[PDB]
Design a protein around this motif. Structure first.
Motif, PDB file in Angstrom:
ATOM      1  N   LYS A 167      15.942  89.407  60.855  1.00 35.46           N
ATOM      2  CA  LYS A 167      15.490  88.135  61.397  1.00 35.46           C
ATOM      3  C   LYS A 167      16.656  87.210  61.677  1.00 35.46           C
ATOM      4  O   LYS A 167      17.691  87.273  61.012  1.00 35.46           O
ATOM      5  N   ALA A 168      16.489  86.361  62.684  1.00 35.92           N
ATOM      6  CA  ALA A 168      17.518  85.396  63.034  1.00 35.92           C
ATOM      7  C   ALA A 168      17.469  84.370  61.915  1.00 35.92           C
ATOM      8  O   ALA A 168      16.395  84.085  61.382  1.00 35.92           O
ATOM      9  N   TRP A 169      18.622  83.825  61.549  1.00 31.33           N
ATOM     10  CA  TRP A 169      18.668  82.839  60.481  1.00 31.33           C
ATOM     11  C   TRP A 169      17.795  81.637  60.842  1.00 31.33           C
ATOM     12  O   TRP A 169      17.980  81.014  61.891  1.00 31.33           O
ATOM     13  N   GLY A 170      16.834  81.330  59.975  1.00 30.43           N
ATOM     14  CA  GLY A 170      15.945  80.207  60.216  1.00 30.43           C
ATOM     15  C   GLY A 170      14.577  80.636  60.711  1.00 30.43           C
ATOM     16  O   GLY A 170      13.639  79.840  60.749  1.00 30.43           O
ATOM     17  N   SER A 171      14.464  81.902  61.092  1.00 29.37           N
ATOM     18  CA  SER A 171      13.208  82.440  61.590  1.00 29.37           C
ATOM     19  C   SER A 171      12.189  82.486  60.469  1.00 29.37           C
ATOM     20  O   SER A 171      12.504  82.203  59.314  1.00 29.37           O
ATOM     21  N   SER A 172      10.965  82.848  60.822  1.00 30.92           N
ATOM     22  CA  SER A 172       9.885  82.967  59.856  1.00 30.92           C
ATOM     23  C   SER A 172      10.107  84.232  59.032  1.00 30.92           C
ATOM     24  O   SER A 172      10.556  85.255  59.555  1.00 30.92           O
ATOM     25  N   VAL A 173       9.779  84.163  57.747  1.00 28.47           N
ATOM     26  CA  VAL A 173       9.961  85.300  56.855  1.00 28.47           C
ATOM     27  C   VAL A 173       8.949  86.417  57.086  1.00 28.47           C
ATOM     28  O   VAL A 173       9.200  87.565  56.725  1.00 28.47           O
ATOM     29  N   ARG A 475       6.464  76.336  47.010  1.00 27.36           N
ATOM     30  CA  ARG A 475       7.530  75.338  46.939  1.00 27.36           C
ATOM     31  C   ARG A 475       6.983  73.957  46.576  1.00 27.36           C
ATOM     32  O   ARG A 475       5.913  73.560  47.041  1.00 27.36           O
ATOM     33  N   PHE A 476       7.729  73.224  45.754  1.00 29.01           N
ATOM     34  CA  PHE A 476       7.330  71.880  45.340  1.00 29.01           C
ATOM     35  C   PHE A 476       7.083  70.995  46.569  1.00 29.01           C
ATOM     36  O   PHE A 476       6.087  70.281  46.642  1.00 29.01           O
ATOM     37  N   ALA A 477       8.003  71.053  47.528  1.00 25.51           N
ATOM     38  CA  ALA A 477       7.909  70.256  48.750  1.00 25.51           C
ATOM     39  C   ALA A 477       6.632  70.508  49.547  1.00 25.51           C
ATOM     40  O   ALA A 477       6.185  69.642  50.297  1.00 25.51           O
ATOM     41  N   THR A 478       6.051  71.693  49.400  1.00 21.33           N
ATOM     42  CA  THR A 478       4.822  72.006  50.112  1.00 21.33           C
ATOM     43  C   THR A 478       3.654  71.442  49.324  1.00 21.33           C
ATOM     44  O   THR A 478       2.724  70.871  49.893  1.00 21.33           O
ATOM     45  N   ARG A 479       3.709  71.603  48.008  1.00 18.49           N
ATOM     46  CA  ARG A 479       2.666  71.080  47.138  1.00 18.49           C
ATOM     47  C   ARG A 479       2.598  69.561  47.286  1.00 18.49           C
ATOM     48  O   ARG A 479       1.523  68.975  47.232  1.00 18.49           O
ATOM     49  N   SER A 480       3.749  68.929  47.492  1.00 17.29           N
ATOM     50  CA  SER A 480       3.797  67.478  47.644  1.00 17.29           C
ATOM     51  C   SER A 480       3.428  67.035  49.059  1.00 17.29           C
ATOM     52  O   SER A 480       3.544  65.853  49.395  1.00 17.29           O
ATOM     53  N   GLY A 506      17.351  75.409  47.782  1.00 15.16           N
ATOM     54  CA  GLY A 506      16.603  74.726  48.821  1.00 15.16           C
ATOM     55  C   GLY A 506      15.838  73.518  48.313  1.00 15.16           C
ATOM     56  O   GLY A 506      15.718  72.508  49.012  1.00 15.16           O
ATOM     57  N   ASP A 507      15.315  73.619  47.094  1.00 17.61           N
ATOM     58  CA  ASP A 507      14.549  72.530  46.492  1.00 17.61           C
ATOM     59  C   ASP A 507      15.319  71.218  46.483  1.00 17.61           C
ATOM     60  O   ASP A 507      14.724  70.149  46.554  1.00 17.61           O
ATOM     61  N   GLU A 508      16.640  71.303  46.399  1.00 20.68           N
ATOM     62  CA  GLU A 508      17.464  70.105  46.364  1.00 20.68           C
ATOM     63  C   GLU A 508      17.401  69.300  47.666  1.00 20.68           C
ATOM     64  O   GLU A 508      17.737  68.113  47.671  1.00 20.68           O
ATOM     65  N   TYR A 509      16.994  69.927  48.772  1.00 24.09           N
ATOM     66  CA  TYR A 509      16.905  69.187  50.027  1.00 24.09           C
ATOM     67  C   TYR A 509      15.468  69.046  50.516  1.00 24.09           C
ATOM     68  O   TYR A 509      15.215  68.482  51.578  1.00 24.09           O
ATOM     69  N   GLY A 510      14.526  69.548  49.724  1.00 24.26           N
ATOM     70  CA  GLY A 510      13.125  69.446  50.089  1.00 24.26           C
ATOM     71  C   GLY A 510      12.564  70.593  50.909  1.00 24.26           C
ATOM     72  O   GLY A 510      11.631  70.394  51.691  1.00 24.26           O
ATOM     73  N   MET A 511      13.112  71.792  50.740  1.00 20.40           N
ATOM     74  CA  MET A 511      12.620  72.945  51.487  1.00 20.40           C
ATOM     75  C   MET A 511      11.147  73.195  51.182  1.00 20.40           C
ATOM     76  O   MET A 511      10.706  73.055  50.042  1.00 20.40           O
ATOM     77  N   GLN A 512      10.387  73.573  52.204  1.00 23.57           N
ATOM     78  CA  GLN A 512       8.970  73.856  52.027  1.00 23.57           C
ATOM     79  C   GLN A 512       8.710  75.353  51.976  1.00 23.57           C
ATOM     80  O   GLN A 512       9.616  76.158  52.175  1.00 23.57           O
ATOM     81  N   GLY A 513       7.464  75.719  51.702  1.00 25.23           N
ATOM     82  CA  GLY A 513       7.111  77.122  51.629  1.00 25.23           C
ATOM     83  C   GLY A 513       5.834  77.357  50.847  1.00 25.23           C
ATOM     84  O   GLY A 513       5.577  76.703  49.836  1.00 25.23           O
ATOM     85  N   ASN A 519       7.877  81.431  50.279  1.00 23.39           N
ATOM     86  CA  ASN A 519       8.623  80.608  49.331  1.00 23.39           C
ATOM     87  C   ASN A 519      10.059  81.122  49.211  1.00 23.39           C
ATOM     88  O   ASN A 519      10.819  80.695  48.343  1.00 23.39           O
ATOM     89  N   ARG A 520      10.423  82.036  50.103  1.00 24.04           N
ATOM     90  CA  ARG A 520      11.757  82.620  50.101  1.00 24.04           C
ATOM     91  C   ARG A 520      12.385  82.506  51.488  1.00 24.04           C
ATOM     92  O   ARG A 520      12.946  83.470  52.007  1.00 24.04           O
ATOM     93  N   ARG A 521      12.293  81.318  52.081  1.00 23.91           N
ATOM     94  CA  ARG A 521      12.845  81.075  53.413  1.00 23.91           C
ATOM     95  C   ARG A 521      14.366  81.032  53.390  1.00 23.91           C
ATOM     96  O   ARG A 521      14.969  80.803  52.341  1.00 23.91           O
TER      97      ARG A 521
END
Ligand SMILES: [Ca+2]
Ligand SMILES: [Ca+2]
Ligand SMILES: [Ca+2]
Length: 637
Positions: A167-173, A475-480, A506-513, A519-521
Motif C-alpha cells: 500500500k502507498a503510505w497513507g492509504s487505507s489498511v 483508537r482513542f481519537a475515534t472513540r472521542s 500516533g495517539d500523540e497527534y490524535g490519529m483515528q482508527g 487501528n494500525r494505520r
C-alpha cells in the motif's frame, strides 16, 4: 480535629509512597516502617493488622504518635512490621473512643475489609527504569519505511494461497479484493524506527520502545511466528536489530533508552518449521509427521488437522509446555540460546518482554489460568531475571492480573486495560475501548481507579503499561469522535497517573482508527511536530513527568470528585514535591478551588501550572485556578 468518638475519614491517609513507607521493595532482612496520617488530634489509638503467609495468621502492631506535618493540620502515627522473607498483607484499625474505622488498599471503611490489603512482598523488585519511564509502542510495518529495498511488494510472496499487497503510505489498511488484511504491507521497518529515534527520544521524550512482533512470520502483525531467531526480512536482519538496540541504548542521540519486545510464546504460526503445515522446509514438522522431532511441541486431538490453537485459529498452533525441564520450556526460556535469553544476552541485550496471550500458556493443550500456567511464568521470571535482573516482564491481560503479579514470582506488571485504558475511555469519551456506549461519572472514575490500583502491589502499580489504545482496540481519537480536546485531557491524566505512561504510535497527534486492522494505520509524519497541538502537549507532559519523581513513584491522593461540574482532582507527592492535578471533564470551563492543604502545601507558598506556565499562591489551604473544558492543570511545587 478532636477526640470526639469519631474518626474523620477525610484526614486519614496511607499508601506506599515515600512519606508513608520507608521500604516499598524490601528484602528478607529489611523491616517495614509505616506511617498513617489523620487530622491532628483526631484519634485515640491505631493498630497495624497484618496477615503473615509464613504463619497463616494475623499479627498486631500498635502504632504510636510520630509527628505533625509542616502545616500542623495532621498527625502521623507509625508502626513497624518485622523483617522476614514471607509475603504479608496489612490493614489499619483506627480508633477514636467509641468510633473505629479500618483502612487498606481500598481506602477507609466503617467495617473491617477482607480484601484489598496492602502488600509486602520481600525481595520482589520491578525495574525502576520501568517505573520511571515513558513508553512508546510501535507496530513496525506502520511507523516509518526507513529502507524501501526490503519492502514487501504486491505478489512478493503468497501465504495460504493469498498474495501479499503493498500500500502507498497513507492509504487505507483494508485489503483490496483478492488480498487479505493480514497480508497488507506499507513498508515500515527497523531502519525507519532507528532513523526516527530523534522524534521519539527528543521531540516527544519517550525513553522506552515497545514493538509488536518483529521476528520472521508471513503476516502483517507477525503473531504467527515462523522463526523466533531471525528478524523478519521485511523489517531487516539481526544486525539491523543490533544497530537499532545500540542507538536506543545510546545517550548521544537523547536520553538512555530501553527496548521491550513482544514475545509470542503461547503458540507459533502454522508455517513454523516445528509445525510446517505448508511444507516450506525440507525438515519434517509436527503437522507433517508424527515422527517429527518436534511432534511433541504441539497437541493434536486428531492428527494432523485438529490441534490445540489460539482461540481456534488454525494458523496459530498452541505450544505444549509439558512438565518442568521440557524441550519447549527449554527453547522458549530455560536454554541460554532460548528465545527469551538469546535477545536478553549480548550482542542483543534487549530490556524486556511483553508477553502475548500470557494467560493461555500451558501444557497438553489446556487453556492456562491454572497452576501449570503460573508455574511456567514463575520459571520464566527466574530465567529472565537470572540473565538480567533489570529486564522487564509485562504480561498481556485484559482483566485483574493480580494472579500473575501479587506473588512477586511472575510478571513485573501487565497491560493495564482494566485499571487504565477502560476507565479512562468511559470517563472521557463515554465509550468502552471497543467504542461501545459506556459512560462513568467522576466519582465512579476515581472509585474504579482506586479499586484497580488496590489489585496490585505498589511496585507493580508503578510499572503497569498504561496506554490510551493499542493494536487490539479502537483508537482513542475515534472513540472521542475526533474531539482533540478529549485527547488533551487523556494525555494530561496519563502523564500524571500511577504506572508507565504508554503511547501507542500516533495517539500523540490524535490519529483515528476503528477496530483491528483500522487501528494500525500508517503514521502521518507531517503531524509529527509540536506544531500539532496534541504533540506539543505530549512533549511538555513528558518533560514534566521526568522532572518530578513524585509523578512516577509518589503517593496518590484523591482531592476532588465533582460530578456536577465534572471536575477531578488528585495529588501526587513525595518528600520533595507536592503536585495537585486538576482535570476538567466538562464541555465548559470552570474555576476551581483546589484544596492543596490536603497535600500539606504551606500557605503563602507558590505553585506553577506546568501546562499553561502560569503561577499561583496558596491562600487558605486553597489554590483558585480556571480550567478550560476537557483540559487540565498541573500545579506543582
Ligand atoms: Ca475525632
Ligand atoms: Ca521497508
Ligand atoms: Ca517440511
Amino acid at each position: 480535629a478532636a477526640n470526639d468518638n469519631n474518626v474523620e475519614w477525610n484526614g486519614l491517609f496511607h499508601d506506599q509512597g515515600p512519606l508513608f513507607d520507608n521500604a516499598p521493595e524490601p528484602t528478607s532482612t529489611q523491616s517495614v516502617t509505616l506511617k498513617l496520617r489523620t487530622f491532628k488530634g483526631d484519634i485515640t489509638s491505631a493498630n497495624i493488622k497484618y496477615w503473615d503467609t509464613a504463619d497463616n495468621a494475623f499479627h498486631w502492631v500498635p502504632m504510636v504518635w510520630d509527628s505533625n506535618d509542616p502545616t500542623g493540620t495532621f498527625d502521623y502515627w507509625k508502626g513497624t512490621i518485622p523483617a522476614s522473607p514471607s509475603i504479608k498483607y496489612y490493614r489499619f484499625q483506627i480508633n477514636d473512643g467509641t468510633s473505629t474505622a479500618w483502612y487498606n488498599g481500598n481506602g477507609p471503611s466503617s467495617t473491617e475489609p477482607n480484601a484489598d490489603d496492602f502488600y509486602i512482598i520481600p525481595n520482589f523488585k520491578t525495574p525502576d527504569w520501568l517505573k520511571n519511564g515513558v513508553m512508546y509502542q510501535i507496530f513496525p510495518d506502520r511507523f516509518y519505511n526507513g529502507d524501501s529495498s526490503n519492502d514487501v511488494q504486491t505478489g512478493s510472496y503468497t501465504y495460504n494461497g493469498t498474495p501479499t499487497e503493498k500500500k502507498a503510505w497513507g492509504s487505507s489498511v483494508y485489503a483490496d479484493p483478492g488480498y487479505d488484511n493480514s497480508l497488507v504491507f506499507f513498508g515500515g521497518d527497523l531502519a525507519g524506527i532507528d532513523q526516527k529515534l530523534g522524534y521519539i527520544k527528543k521531540t516527544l521524550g519517550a525513553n522506552i520502545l515497545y514493538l509488536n512482533p518483529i521476528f520472521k512470520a508471513p503476516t502483517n502483525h507477525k503473531y504467527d511466528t515462523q522463526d523466533y531467531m531471525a528478524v523478519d526480512p521485511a523489517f531487516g536482519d539481526n544486525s539491523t536489530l543490533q544497530t537499532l538496540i545500540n542507538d536506543i541504548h545510546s545517550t548521544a542521540n537523547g536520553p538512555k533508552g530501553y527496548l521491550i519486545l513482544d514475545g509470542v510464546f503461547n503458540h507459533t504460526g502454522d508455517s513454523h518449521p516445528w509445525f510446517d503445515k505448508y511444507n516450506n522446509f525440507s525438515s519434517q514438522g509436527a503437522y507433517e509427521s508424527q515422527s517429527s522431532p518436534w511432534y511433541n511441541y504441539y497437541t493434536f486431538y486428531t492428527w494432523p488437522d485438529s490441534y490445540a490453537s489460539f482461540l481456534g485459529a488454525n494458523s496459530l498452533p498452541k505450544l505444549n509446555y509439558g512438565n518442568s525441564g521440557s524441550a519447549v520450556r527449554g527453547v522458549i526460556y530455560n536454554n541460554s540460546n532460548s528465545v527469551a535469553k538469546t535477545y536478553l544476552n549480548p550482542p542483543y541485550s534487549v530490556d524486556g518482554w511483553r508477553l502475548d496471550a500470557a494467560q493461555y500458556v500451558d501444557a497438553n493443550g489446556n487453556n492456562g489460568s491454572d497452576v501449570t500456567n503460573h508455574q511456567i511464568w514463575s520459571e520464566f521470571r527466574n530465567a529472565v531475571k537470572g540473565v538480567n535482573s533489570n529486564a522487564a516482564i509485562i504480561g498481556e491481560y485484559w482483566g485483574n492480573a493480580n494472579p500473575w503479579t501479587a506473588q512477586g514470582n511472575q510478571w513485573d506488571a501487565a497491560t493495564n486495560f482494566d485499571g487504565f485504558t477502560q476507565p479512562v475511555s468511559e470517563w472521557i469519551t463515554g465509550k468502552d475501548y471497543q467504542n461501545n456506549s459506556a459512560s462513568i461519572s467522576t466519582t465512579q472514575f476515581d472509585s474504579w481507579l482506586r479499586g484497580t490500583r488496590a489489585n496490585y502491589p505498589t511496585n507493580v502499580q508503578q510499572s503497569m503499561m498504561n496506554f490510551l489504545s493499542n493494536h487490539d482496540i479502537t483508537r482513542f481519537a475515534t472513540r472521542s469522535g475526533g474531539d482533540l480536546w478529549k485527547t488533551y485531557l487523556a494525555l494530561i491524566f496519563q502523564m500524571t497517573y500511577v504506572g508507565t505512561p504508554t503511547i501507542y504510535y500516533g495517539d500523540e497527534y490524535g490519529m483515528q482508527g476503528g477496530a483491528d486492522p483500522d487501528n494500525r494505520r500508517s503514521f502521518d509524519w507531517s503531524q509529527a511536530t509540536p506544531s500539532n497541538s496534541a504533540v506539543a502537549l505530549t512533549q511538555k507532559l513528558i518533560t514534566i513527568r521526568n522532572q518530578y519523581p513524585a509523578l512516577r513513584t509518589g503517593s496518590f491522593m484523591t482531592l476532588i470528585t465533582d460530578d456536577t461540574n465534572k471536575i477531578y482532582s488528585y495529588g501526587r507527592f513525595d518528600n520533595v514535591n507536592r503536585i495537585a492535578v486538576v482535570l476538567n471533564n466538562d464541555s465548559v470551563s470552570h474555576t476551581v478551588n483546589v484544596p492543596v492543604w490536603q497535600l500539606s502545601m504551606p500557605n503563602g507558598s507558590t505553585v506553577t501550572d506546568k501546562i499553561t506556565g502560569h503561577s499561583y499562591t496558596v491562600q487558605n489551604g486553597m489554590v483558585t485556578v480556571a480550567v478550560d473544558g476537557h483540559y487540565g492543570a498541573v500545579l506543582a511545587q
